[PDB]
Amino acid sequence: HYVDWRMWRDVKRRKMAYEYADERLRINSLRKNTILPKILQDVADEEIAALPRDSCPVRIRNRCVMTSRPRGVKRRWRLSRIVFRHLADHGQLSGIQRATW
């Protein structure tokens, strides 16, 4: 019942990235060093690259939770500039007022 399929695909991505977060963390530690042998680091480069694509955190997009807008999103409220203003202009956001100086 999400806004659109683009939103639904990001929900799945955030779920798969939460399951492999530890497995990816432990493998990257091996790659991010000059201590272990190159032979071992080469095997970890193939193990983390064989994990599903949607497990990668860079493929996540901070969309608006009300409209699924990919751009123009405020991270503190997780809303788009259009929805944020609609609530702020009606006095529904605590403390938010218009600036004049």
Next chain:
Amino acid sequence: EEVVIPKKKTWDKVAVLQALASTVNRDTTAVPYVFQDDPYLMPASSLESRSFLLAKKSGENVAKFIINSYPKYFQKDIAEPHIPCLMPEYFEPQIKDISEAALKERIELRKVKASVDMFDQLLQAGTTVSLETTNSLLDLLCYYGDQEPSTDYH
């Protein structure tokens, strides 16, 4: 030189609230707290006083009916610390197998019909039934009189 440190005082988590409630008295101009402080909603007669709380108690039962019929909507817990009194109750048996521990779970939920109909199956199989388990079934049957407890809705 030695400084005398005072002894520590302790009290219950509600002690500071009971001391503040001792500083007030009943308000003569008002109706019982449970009612809505509003002229249109204030009970005028004694019939309204009783019919207004029976309708508010009926909405609490309509919500509990919906909460226990669709638990999945209310399972998400965001409270910290956890509040056990604000989570759906599960009245259905979970151990579907026939065993001695599966009957005890149907006696704690006061399932007279299921427990007795399942006690025969456990007895028919011939499995040894402890005397502390068969005594717990009599209490459930001797109290309600081989009848199901009252429920919100069937």
Next chain:
Amino acid sequence: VDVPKDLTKPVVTISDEPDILYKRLSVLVKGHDKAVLDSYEYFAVLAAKELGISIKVHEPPRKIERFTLLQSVHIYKKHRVQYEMRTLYRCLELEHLTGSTADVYLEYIQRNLPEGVAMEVTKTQLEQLPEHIKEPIW
């Protein structure tokens, strides 16, 4: 004419363990409204005087966080809207308290903390040197 002939008071037992000491108790309350803080100050200061507590009050400088957003849904870059959140502060510096006195005063004012008002309570406890620190072992 109707009054409780006798009253029940909550039990406050005295423990054997010693009580905690607090050199200072700094209470920092935030809010978007200044009169709600001027009114909470009057309540917290008067509640300290009746309990026999030393209190000092000062007003830290405010903070204003601003940000701008596009006015239109499409194009018209030049035209934008600017918003702000104003955070006002009020610090209540208490001194020379005990664990029990602070436990009571804080509960009294924390419960009556109005809407839109947070609090940061910094507690400065007094301790004594541990046993191992008195003399060296080597």
Next chain:
Amino acid sequence: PRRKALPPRTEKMAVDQDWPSVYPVAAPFKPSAVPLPVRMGYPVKKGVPMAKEGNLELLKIPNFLHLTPVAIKKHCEALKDFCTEWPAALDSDEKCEKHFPIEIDSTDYVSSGPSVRNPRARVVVLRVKLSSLNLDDHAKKKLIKLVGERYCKTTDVLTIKTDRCPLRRQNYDYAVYLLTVLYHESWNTEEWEKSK
């Protein structure tokens, strides 16, 4: 016929009553309970501010009707049985640092919401002057080299801030433990120290 609303109970109130009994705790503004002709709002041309009946602006206010001076003085009279007396000996701050040379700081945060958690509450700070510790010339010189920028020569205070562990009782223990291993290693003399 239609059900009619009763008159507001503010009329039955007397002037010499007990207000705390009316507004014992925090509650929204009830115009049928507050016996004041208070108005709020920006008036129209040749008009007057809106009346309390139906006014949403007075409902937005976090009132202080439950915290009148009469109640505060009456509330605290019942709270003096929970309090303890401060040692008369410890009059000033110079005398507090002679018997209690260590100061532990810890902050608690109160915010609205269903969760009370806050990661900023685990932090613990421990301050102590080096003049209150049983140190010699060597130990003091060595201790100042281990702590680094945690010691302020202007004030002669050692500041230990711990935020490693989840809970605040653990960081308290960690800080005391750190002060202990520092004190003892400072006293200990090693061979390499000769090559200074």
Next chain:
Amino acid sequence: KNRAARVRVSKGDKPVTYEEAHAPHYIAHRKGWLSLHTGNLDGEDHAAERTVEDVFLRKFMWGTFPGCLADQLVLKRRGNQLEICAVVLRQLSPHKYYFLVGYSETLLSYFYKCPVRLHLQTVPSKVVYKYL
């Protein structure tokens, strides 16, 4: 021209409320805020979750009290509590108000895991600030 939260002038036969008659540039000069919490204060957290709860509450109450709300809600948070303050009409019977107060207070307590209390203030008719 600017349009946000402005009720356009008309012949003079349209009644409006106080909050509905003032535009966004009056929100801290002649109006207050309909929701009051600590999320949007400096150094505070969880301002995004408090906003989704507000959006849902205003809709839950609009469809739970259909045709009864006289003016917008006023949400208040004091620690764990959540206080909903509403201005309603007098058409509906009090028997049905008490049912919905207990049904909503309970359903919302189990949903948001917080004690919820609802405060009604009945008015005979929708208050009118002026006519546009």
Next chain:
Amino acid sequence: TKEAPETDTSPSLWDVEFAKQLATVNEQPLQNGFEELIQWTKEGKLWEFPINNEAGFDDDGSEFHEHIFLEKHLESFPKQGPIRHFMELVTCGLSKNPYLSVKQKVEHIEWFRNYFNEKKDILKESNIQFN
């Protein structure tokens, strides 16, 4: 009376339902606002004041030496070599982490121990003897 009754034995249904009848005689509706707060606080719905940010959260009764001193778990690893240096960095960061539990910090370590047991043949080419 009798010195020691059958306290271990749990109350029967007849005793659990009779205690519910003794909690109804004193049952009365909330008479004031304070009592509502008291009822909620006892149930557990309302917060207990003064506010403690760590309420209801004790990390399995773990002491500080279980979070910071993790070199006790490195006894199944080479005492000297690259694996030791690497695993001496994992436990240094795991000691600076207030967001994990001791039960979660050991999982990380046990994973490396099992990971190096599968790469033994590859660690022999580099002249590294892991167990």
Next chain:
Amino acid sequence: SLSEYAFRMSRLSARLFGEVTRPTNSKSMKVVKLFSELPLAKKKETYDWYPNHHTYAELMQTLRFLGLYRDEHQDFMDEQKRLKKLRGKEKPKKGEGKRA
């Protein structure tokens, strides 16, 4: 560029405060930062970014069939979908469509 006494003293302070002891380069110090902090994917702002729209939409769909919530929006599109059946603009059967 440190004296031997200063180096052996700093190495000691690191041991006390639980810092790195062995000499480690900047590349390998990232392993300390990877385990000393919670990964982005496990942070609560990431995996709980969206509210669960299933619960909100399924709950209020059930409350509407129960008679306790009135959705003025469904009523709108339910009346339009009823007037398009009288006009002949009805959704076809799946599989047995206009095309084949």
